[PDB]
Amino acid sequence: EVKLVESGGGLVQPGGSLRLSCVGSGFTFSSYEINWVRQAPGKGLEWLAVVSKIGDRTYYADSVRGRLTISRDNSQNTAYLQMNSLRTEDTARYYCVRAWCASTCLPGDIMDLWGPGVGVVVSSL
Amino acid sequence: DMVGHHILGACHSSWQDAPIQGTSQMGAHGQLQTFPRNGYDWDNQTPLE
């Protein structure tokens, strides 16, 4: 029943911008935090970004600080990720994950339900 | 008059094992003693951030 399906990703040239939109259904999206996590095809997971419950208090990762800007709209139950600049390293499957507080509160400790994943394939060709 | 004198011996409970986190064990007088997980209430199935 509960889902975090997302879309808005595709093949883009390097040094470009992308708009990833993640929608949620049937789990009161305004009350739970949502994070964005990167998984490289062979280099394991990597946590990218956090937006809090209200929409403010955004804290990113060290490797993508400033490069990625996250946003949240609780009216239509959406979380947006802006990839303002993209190198060739950023080709990966991006997941929007629901994560509430167990020990570490705002970065999230229990990533309960993961989105199906959207594949960003940056390429100069 | 008469008085009964007794010396009760030493009393000490047996050594037990500290429970693993998340384990809820049946206890005394019909009470389910819970050592719940992080982020949950005293009831192990109720979230508590």
Q: Is B49 on the interface with A (CB under 8 A)?
A: yes
For residue A52, count other CB atoms closer than 10 A to its CB: 15
Q: Distance from B40 to chain A by nearest Cα, in Å? A: 8
CA-nearest residue of chain B to A101?
A: B49
Q: Is B47 on the interface with A (CB under 8 A)?
A: yes
Q: Is B46 on the interface with A (CB under 8 A)?
A: no
- A54-63, long-range: CB < 8 A, 24+ apart: A57/A106, A59/A106, A59/A107
**Residue A97, strand partner residues:** A35, A114
In SS3 terms, chain A reads as CCECCEECCCEECCCCCEEEEEECECCCHHHCCEEEEEECCCCCEEEEEEECCCCCCCEECCCCECCEEEEEECCCCEEEEEECCCCHHHCEEEEEEEEECCCCCCCCCEEEEECCCEEEEECCC
Burial degree of A115 (CB within 10 A; 0-12, 13-18, 19+): buried
CA-nearest residue of chain A to B47?
A: A102
Spatial separation of the C-alpha atoms in residues A101 and A107, rounded to whole Å: 8
Spatial separation of the C-alpha atoms in residues B41 and B8, rounded to whole Å: 42
DSSP single-letter state for residue B12: -
DSSP H/E element including B25: strand B24-26
Tell me the backbone φ, ψ of residue A31, rounded to 5 degrees. -100, -10
Q: Are A106 and A99 in contact (CB under 8 A)?
A: no
Q: Are A23 and A5 in contact (CB under 8 A)?
A: yes
* Residue A89, amino acid: E
Tell me the backbone φ, ψ of residue A90, rounded to 5 degrees. -85, 5
Resolution in A: 3.5
Mutate to test the interface with B, among A52, A103, A110 (most CBs of B within 10 A): A110
Q: Is A105 on the interface with B (CB under 8 A)?
A: yes
Spell out which residues of chain B touch residue A103, defining contact as CB-CB under 8 Å: 38-39
Q: Are A16 and A91 in contact (CB under 8 A)?
A: no
For residue A37, count other CB atoms closer than 10 A to its CB: 22
CA-nearest residue of chain A to B36?
A: A102
Spatial separation of the C-alpha atoms in residues A48 and A20, rounded to whole Å: 13
Q: Distance from B7 to chain A by nearest Cα, in Å? A: 52
